Symmetry: C6
Subunit: 212 residues, 6 copies
């Protein structure tokens, strides 16, 4: 990653072993639960495209998701070569192509130069956005149940049902329709009390009333 030397200077640093191991352990233990994405973005703070490819490469399993990730990266790189289609002025740098942002045709020197340019170009941030777009698709794919099939059990507490509802909703959406769907699929007892509270009630109010 490109961090800050105490001279306010932007220098390149090696990815720490602690960060490498952290990202690896997150994937092995959490698979593609929705919270893996914000953990990836946080662990890749200030990363060059080379750092992002290093992080994706250290993943041992989940090679089906990784191939899907590549196919998303290639479709975003194609769009970049459209919206931002040779001599190079002194003190300046070339313009990046989609393969340069993904790190398939660019070097660490070219990436560092783009990210420390006084007219800067954040190829690491552009690449990370493409990666997160693909990770969203993978999280949607790995979600076992649709939001429509989340229904409160007969003897299941309302808290545990809302836990499953919003965790499913997080994976899918990687609003009034969600509120109507939440009350509609509560068990018939809890359901009636939710209808009796009236509309526009906060989630805190619904859960303390359904606590019986």
């Amino acid at each position: 990653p490109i961090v800050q030397n105490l001279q306010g200077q932007m220098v390149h640093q090696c990815i720490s072993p602690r960060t490498l191991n952290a990202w690896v352990k997150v994937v092995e233990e959490k698979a593609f639960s929705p919270e893996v994405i914000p953990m990836f973005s946080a662990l890749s703070c200030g990363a060059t495209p080379q750092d992002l490819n290093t992080m994706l490469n250290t993943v041992g399993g989940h090679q089906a998701a990784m191939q899907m990730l590549k196919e998303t990266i290639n479709e975003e790189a194609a769009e970049w070569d459209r919206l931002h289609p040779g001599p190079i002025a002194p003190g300046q740098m070339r313009e990046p192509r989609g393969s340069d942002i993904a790190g398939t045709t660019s070097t660490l020197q070219e990436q560092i130069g783009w990210m420390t340019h006084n007219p800067p170009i954040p190829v690491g941030e552009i690449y990370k956005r493409w990666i997160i777009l693909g990770l969203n698709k993978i999280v949607r794919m790995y979600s076992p149940t649709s939001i429509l099939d989340i229904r409160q059990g007969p003897k299941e507490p309302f808290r545990d049902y809302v836990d499953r509802f919003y965790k499913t909703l997080r994976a899918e959406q990687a609003n009034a329709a969600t509120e109507t769907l939440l009350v509609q699929n509560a068990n018939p007892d809890c359901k009636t009390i939710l209808k009796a509270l009236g509309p526009g009630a906060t989630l805190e109010e619904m859960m303390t009333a359904c606590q019986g």
Copy 2:
């Protein structure tokens, strides 16, 4: 977060992997026990709104509580807007800017390091801690009125359960009214000794009298 450079300038640093893992471990091992809130505040020292959202996003389960937290944040942001309705006049943040939904990292750093500053991270953390206090209270299993000393339970263990329950029910907020409930719900043998101690006794004297 925003930290101090050896050049004396407030600079932005990436949230460390050890801090991310410590916060995830706390939530997984303690859920919403009262002591989680001070640990959250300590682990988010100097945090920007983006850093606070990263910490909240790394929470795996408890999505009912997370949605409740969003509703509290939404209400605090709305009240902030109602309470905050020149060449070079800086644009001041709205509730959504403080919460980080409509503001960039660069804008958040601008407010926090301005002269005079607007501590959007400290403001946002105040809203989060309020919502976490609500969650801790709702998650508290037992009422303080139901904490009663067992016939063979040592007085110290009873007081441990009592004050830990009181902490969850008041969400760690600050009484002889608690002293009377503590004496009233002690078992008959200890209650007699506590009555004989006279009023206004310290807790240290009370537990030394009920040790035999």
Copy 3:
């Protein structure tokens, strides 16, 4: 806490996660064994009152001890106010300012880095260590007068229990009690040694 940077100035640092975790694990492992107190003083090196309240707040159990601690802190703050009554001059802290209930972080830093300093962090830690001493003495399972060498207990094990018990509660009186509560065999060997025997001599004469 307050540490020094590379310009000779005292700068404020965020409390570190490894320090926080170390203090939590100390309370979970050692409860209120006497050695918990010096560990607290070492982990709170340079702490502001805000940092001291953070460390105490991260304790999960032992809430009976924590309430006792608040009562000790309250009495120390009241005594500070009694000894510092109100009369270019800097405002001086109240007892609640040292304890962090009525002072902001900037006020605590301003006091701790003033010339000359008012070390509200070290004053507060003093009050806290006073309270921990009472908790450790409370948690002490047995009185020192009841620590007695078993008829088949090695003299070294008896001395280990003796001095660990004395530490939680707190010299010629202790040497008298140590010899007096030994079993009749070791007691005879210790009395035959006479006065002026070190603990090393006493433990050697009874090592059999």
Copy 4:
């Protein structure tokens, strides 16, 4: 390794105990799975040849693969000597002598020489060149430890499609040394070796379907 100073100058730092122990654990746990190679490269960021030799020396077992690695490095060193022979004679003041293949591999060079090469203006990256040779030898080891051919990866009658694709592309990664390869034949081989139920659904999708569409169709 050689890292940027807080002045901003390339200085030598000792290899850290955390980096050393990390590399030892990845080999004890993962052996020579394909993802071990990008982990080796990441843990040896900025490494000198001496550092690279230290990491290779901490491997306790797998000595057959380590001898193979030595032989691969020897062939790359000989090739370096054929393309970059050292001009004999005295070295100009303020200059470094030209490195031979054994200097890059760290057998006939000192730590002080390796530092002088890597921090020279312009730098001669003896550490990066040596790591390139090491990764070439590691590619061979990954293939040797992954015997199962991609042609023998077949979805079980009740194996979930996602697990079958996991085994497929993990086997392909070892065979192809983690090299990005766009090829239609390997994507038709994936459909070809799916089980009867999913293979019917995949053919009912039509040709030229993305992996996301295929895994969604066989999600049942």
Copy 5:
């Protein structure tokens, strides 16, 4: 500790939590084996008298040994006062940290010429810990004798591990070379004396390698 900064200056740092934890675990695992002493010396690198008292205070058990350590420290402190009778020079209680503030300890340690109160106190502690390792040593060196079926390597292992606790890690002496051969089993005893005098341990062990 008093350690080098980055600007070439000696400054005071707080004792590290990782250092405190390492010292606690060492005592828990090894008790008072001889190798505990060099571990204590390494973990107390640059320590002030306050840091040394902090480390000793984190020891939970072993309070019999800790009281003996206090008695050794008091003897060394009393001998310091007798050898330094009355720039205020530190008394024994100042070196041990019972009557000295942290600022006074730093004032002595960083003076020119310095008075290293941390190193002096560490010497007293190590002298006291050596007496504890010796007293807690289970066996005397004279009772280490090679088993009839015991490999010679295993006998030499027990001999020097016992001699280390006995001679409290102090330094090939003639009596120890004769005692090692004298207490070997009659078979290897013959092979050793056949080699003659002044043989290396590598030659004694290769001969009796079995």
Copy 6:
């Protein structure tokens, strides 16, 4: 150890608890296997003679090997005193006194003297000199501790060829103490099983180990 500060100067730094615990662990878990030696050299990077003695002092067991190590250090120190005699007289201003063998081994030198030699211009690397002596003794320990001989390593009946080569070069590493050949190449083919040995000769002359293990893959 001696490390570089932000003034480009070499300064003394305390040895870290991570380094001490790491060295203790590799000895407890791997004794004196050949891979222990490069681990000692990496963890002692930049070490003064005092640091090197600390690491050796943290070894609890293996005291027979540690006494052999002392006798190897004593013989290297005596050879240093023969080849580098100390000259009598006062020490020139701004210079260090000449180190003798016991100074390099840290028995008669102070830490400040060790720092003085290691940071002088030009530097006398007494830590690197001492470490070489230690590694010489440790190599003699790896060979004495080695159980099997390279001659007695023969391939089993149904044992895969890769497992036989694994055991072959691991034993060879202990016999040479990580020191590195048609001699070892012919001992590898001679001590194989008759099924693979036949195919090994048919491979031809000077075949690479890759070609050899692919020829006896099954």
